[PDB]
Structures are given as C-alpha cells and as structure tokens.
Design a protein around this ligand. Sequence first.
Ligand SMILES: CC(C)(C)NC(=O)[C@@H]1C[C@@H]2CCCC[C@@H]2CN1C[C@@H](O)[C@H](Cc1ccccc1)NC(=O)[C@H](CC(N)=O)NC(=O)c1ccc2ccccc2n1
Lengths: 99, 99
Amino acid sequence: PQITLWKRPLVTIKIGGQLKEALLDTGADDTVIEEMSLPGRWKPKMIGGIGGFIKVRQYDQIIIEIAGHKAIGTVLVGPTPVNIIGRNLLTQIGATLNF
Amino acid sequence: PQITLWKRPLVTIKIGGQLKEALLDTGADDTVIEEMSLPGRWKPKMIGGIGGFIKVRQYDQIIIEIAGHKAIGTVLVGPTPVNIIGRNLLTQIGATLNF
Ligand SMILES: CC(C)(C)NC(=O)[C@@H]1C[C@@H]2CCCC[C@@H]2CN1C[C@@H](O)[C@H](Cc1ccccc1)NC(=O)[C@H](CC(N)=O)NC(=O)c1ccc2ccccc2n1
C-alpha cells in the first residue's frame, strides 16, 4: 500500500489479543505502546523524546500484526498518548520513505 | 529517492543559508530546528512530545531546501534534541510511505 502524509499515518495493529490504532513513525528508533497488561518478564528502561524522558517496561520477542503484516520484536510499554510503530518493526514489514 | 529504515533517515538541509543535518519524521506534525539565528519575524509557541512540553519560536513562510527539494513553510526553533522535518514540509516535497 501507499500512505500519504496529509493526515497522521494511523493503521490498525493486533498485540496481546487486542486491536489498537498506531502511528507509522520513521523518526522513532523504538516501538512504544500505551499501558496494557502484557504477560511475562520485562526489564526497566528510560526513553527520551522532545520534552525529556519517561519510564517504560521492555518486553522482548512480542508478536504484533501491523496493517495485516506479521512482525516480532521488542515493544516498550508505558504512559504515551499515542501508540508508535518505530524503525525496529517498520523494517520487518518492508516499509520505505519515497520522494 | 527511496530510503530504507535500517538506519535513521538523516539528510542535509539548508536554512537561513546554513547547512545542517535533519531527520525525516512521519510521526511529527511540525518541523523543529535547534537554536539558531534566523532571518524573519517570530512569535512564541508551545509544543509537546514524548517527555512533555517545550517553548519555541514560530517562524512562518521560511525557505528551506531538503535533500535538494524546495519547501516554503512554518519552522519552529528551540531546545529540541535532534533537528526534525515533520509532515507540514514532507507533504511539500511529495513524500509518501510505501510497503
Ligand atoms: C517533533 C514534535 C512535532 C514535537 N512531535 C513529536 O515529538 C511527536 C509527538 C507524538 C506524541 C507524543 C508521543 C510521540 C509522538 C511522535 N513524536 C514524533 C517522534 O517521531 C519523535 C521525534 C523525535 C526524534 C528525535 C528526538 C526528538 C524527537 N520520536 C521520539 O520521541 C523517539 C522515541 C523513541 N525512543 O523511539 N525518540 C528517538 O527515537 C530519539 C532519537 C535520538 C535521541 C537523541 C537524544 C535524545 C532523545 C532521542 N530520541
């Protein structure tokens, strides 16, 4: 598919058995998902953005479906206003920027 | 060009006649550049992201060259950690996401 940038590039994702809306984000190194009760072991992490840092939980080898395309990798969970799909997962679904 | 996402999508820009490095960022609504002297009129504004809100100078109708392509639009100047090119200027140069 091709997505224009007139509006935020939001798509449907599936994670932990739940459907959510998330932003395809070429400026994010990491994938950050809103607070949810994911099972299993995690490691403490701090991540930065414009504004400063927030505390998150790092989960490894998490399955996520992005606009119908399957991926598996690291997902950070904590208090974000928007679910963001970063480059660690955009590469797995074959995404590029074109102009 | 077609840009893949295994590395950060960094390009050269020209702004106020000066060369800088900046990130092509589909997750950003706006364009935010590090503190600099810039010819043009400005007004105070506040913007947010992952760790909270910061104070910036808003400059309208600024000429900027992005990887060899011309844009003329709004640039925010302030204590951002990384120079970011957001959707207000990505749309001007014809950029799309593809997968
Ligand atoms: C630029 C502005 C217009 C303020 N927009 C945004 O900030 C929106 C805000 C939205 C709501 C809050 C949740 C984030 C989304 C997406 N972001 C865009 C989004 O693309 C944003 C832009 C950015 C990049 C680099 C440095 C600063 C800011 N990325 C991020 O916040 C990601 C988060 C992450 N850890 O993956 N940061 C980075 O990937 C990153 C990279 C280098 C750094 C160097 C020093 C300090 C911090 C650094 N952070």
